[PDB]
Amino acid sequence: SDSNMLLNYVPVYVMLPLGVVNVDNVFEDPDGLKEQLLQLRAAGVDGVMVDVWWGIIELKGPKQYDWRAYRSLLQLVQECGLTLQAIMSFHQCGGNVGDIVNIPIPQWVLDIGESNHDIFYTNRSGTRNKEYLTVGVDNEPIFHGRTAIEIYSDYMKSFRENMSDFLESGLIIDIEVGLGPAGELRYPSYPQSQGWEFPGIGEFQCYDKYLKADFKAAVARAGHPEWELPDDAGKYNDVPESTGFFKSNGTYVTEKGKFFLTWYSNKLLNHGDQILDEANKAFLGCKVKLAIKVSGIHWWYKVENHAAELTAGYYNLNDRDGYRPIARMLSRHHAILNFSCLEMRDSEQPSDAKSGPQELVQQVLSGGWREDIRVAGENALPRYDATAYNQIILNARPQGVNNNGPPKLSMFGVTYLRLSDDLLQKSNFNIFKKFVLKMHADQDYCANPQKYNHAITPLKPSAPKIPIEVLLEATKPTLPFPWLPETDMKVDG
Numbered sequence: 197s198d199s200n201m202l203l204n205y206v207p208v209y210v211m212l213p214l215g216v217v218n219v220d221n222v223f224e225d226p227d228g229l230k231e232q233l234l235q236l237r238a239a240g241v242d243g244v245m246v247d248v249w250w251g252i253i254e255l256k257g258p259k260q261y262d263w264r265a266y267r268s269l270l271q272l273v274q275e276c277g278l279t280l281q282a283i284m285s286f287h288q289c290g291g292n293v294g295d296i297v298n299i300p301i302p303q304w305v306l307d308i309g310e311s312n313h314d315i316f317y318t319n320r321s322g323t324r325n326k327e328y329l330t331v332g333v334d335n336e337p338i339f340h341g342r343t344a345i346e347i348y349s350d351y352m353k354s355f356r357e358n359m360s361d362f363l364e365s366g367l368i369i370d371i372e373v374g375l376g377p378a379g380e381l382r383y384p385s386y387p388q389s390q391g392w393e394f395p396g397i398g399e400f401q402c403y404d405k406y407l408k409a410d411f412k413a414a415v416a417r418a419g420h421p422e423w424e425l426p427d428d429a430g431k432y433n434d435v436p437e438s439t440g441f442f443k444s445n446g447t448y449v450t451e452k453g454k455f456f457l458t459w460y461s462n463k464l465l466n467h468g469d470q471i472l473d474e475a476n477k478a479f480l481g482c483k484v485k486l487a488i489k490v491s492g493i494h495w496w497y498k499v500e501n502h503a504a505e506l507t508a509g510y511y512n513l514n515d516r517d518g519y520r521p522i523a524r525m526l527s528r529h530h531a532i533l534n535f536s537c538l539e540m541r542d543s544e545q546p547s548d549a550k551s552g553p554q555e556l557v558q559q560v561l562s563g564g565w566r567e568d569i570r571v572a573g574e575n576a577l578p579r580y581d582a583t584a585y586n587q588i589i590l591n592a593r594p595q596g597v598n599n600n601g602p603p604k605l606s607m608f609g610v611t612y613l614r615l616s617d618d619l620l621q622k623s624n625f626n627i628f629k630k631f632v633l634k635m636h637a638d639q640d641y642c643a644n645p646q647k648y649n650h651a652i653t654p655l656k657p658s659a660p661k662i663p664i665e666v667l668l669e670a671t672k673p674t675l676p677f678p679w680l681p682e683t684d685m686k687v688d689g
């Protein structure tokens with residue numbers, strides 16, 4: 197049922213290879229990428245996603261931006277008939293799953309870090325993680341007179357101005373505002389760089405002097421100036437029952453622990469809100485949407501302590517929704533929540549990881565729809581198989597196609613990790629083409645997104661700030677929307 201089917205279309209994007217622009221700010225292989233992009237175009241892909249790496253662009257020094265290689269990249273994407281999701285990548289490539297190229301943050305910032313080790317997220321043992329600047333220095337004017345948020349703001353404004361022709365022509369469909377490690381709004385609680393291995397509970401990352409002082413002032417204002425940061429939460433690879441903090445009746449449910457967890461998770465809410473304020477200023481009037489990325493911390497979802505979510509900064513329990521407040525925060529920015537784990541089934545995970553990706557995805561998407569925001573997502577891990585694609589398609593339209601109109605529930609888009617030679621091999625790519633077709637509700641690729649009610653209009657000012665107490669009203673548990681057990685649009689392979 198052709199046009200009602202078109203109202204069911206979910207666009208599909210593909211991540212480019214890491215390092216398409218190298219650390220020296222050279223677009224090394226345009227000819228090879230061109231051939232790959234033309235295969236994606238023929239396959240019906242709507243667009244691509246790329247990291248616009250801060251440590252490449254602003255390498256020479258403060259406000260010394262070189263946009264030239266990225267202009268050549270954008271030009272090629274445009275020539276190949278694809279749109280672009282541009283990530284403002286304020287983080288390091290190298291130390292997270294799948295990272296096959298090393299791209300640090302700018303050396304001039306690391307130089308400041310050599311003098312001030314507290315600009316980095318720090319664990320209880322004192323290890324400094326150089327992949328992202330701590331939320332602690334968001335508003336500290338310690339970077340040759342600028343704060344970290346001013347750095348991010350200036351970068352986004354310069355991107356907007358220098359890419360103004362591509363923006364005007366509609367090349368860029370969304371700006372993915374990087375907010376932490378791997379571009380995600382989270383703490384680096386599971387760093388492979390410090391020996392973490394799935395499914396360890398991870399560790400709290402609030403021991404830098406700025407966060408520690410902020411915490412101490414907060415507990416004092418709460419009438420408990422003696423409270424200290426958790427000291428019984430174990431180490432990266434522990435299991436929750438081995439710790440005082442996360443065991444049954446342990447510190448996480450005490451007044452002290454609940455205060456800490458609230459404080460810790462609020463830092464991320466406010467970090468995202470404040471940086472999105474700068475993103476809306478930078479892109480005001482441009483025909484783009486804003487997006488953020490939320491990591492899918494599915495391990496320990498199935499036990500009452502949700503320990504790995506908690507150490508990541510998502511204060512999500514069976515009786516406290518730690519994601520719907522993020523969705524509510526996004527609403528004033530008219531922003532998209534880009535989630536993860538869209539491909540995963542619980543049965544694929546080891547039993548001892550107490551892993552609930554299906555239910556986690558259902559929760560987060562439901563919360564975004566409950567808060568009347570757009571929700572998009574990615575697969576967490578590389579997958580080429582029909583099981584994976586059918587699970588993504590299920591999540592994309594969890595109550596199936598509406599033959600009579602738009603679906604009551606649909607994701608706003610899905611971005612596939614990642615373009616590689618493997619994807620393009622005959623069988624794999626044939627399956628991928630079926631995935632695209634089913635995401636498109638059996639319709640041919642639709643170049644004009646207005647046709648499937650994805651028109652982009654000039655970005656408006658953000659709506660007024662929402663106080664933290666109103667954001668935290670969204671912690672009230674809600675029933676998720678019901679999900680089908682399988683999609684009605686399987687790839688058929």
Ligand SMILES: OC[C@H]1O[C@H](O[C@H]2[C@H](O)[C@@H](O)[C@@](O)(O[C@H]3[C@H](O)[C@@H](O)[C@@H](O[C@H]4[C@H](O)[C@@H](O)[C@@H](O)O[C@@H]4CO)O[C@@H]3CO)O[C@@H]2CO)[C@H](O)[C@@H](O)[C@@H]1O
Pocket residue numbers: 211246247283285287288289290292293294295377378379380394489490491492493494536537574575576577613
């Ligand atoms: O080019 C865009 C960015 O690509 C990389 O970041 C991806 C990341 O690779 C991808 O996994 C995901 O979806 O991030 C989280 C993910 O949501 C979590 O699930 C978790 O992954 C764990 C697996 O789920 C779990 O089963 C097990 O295998 O362990 C995994 C952790 O090692 O963590 C990943 C990482 O946070 O999205 C991000 C963002 O697109 C790249 O690293 C980043 O630099 C690029 O900006």
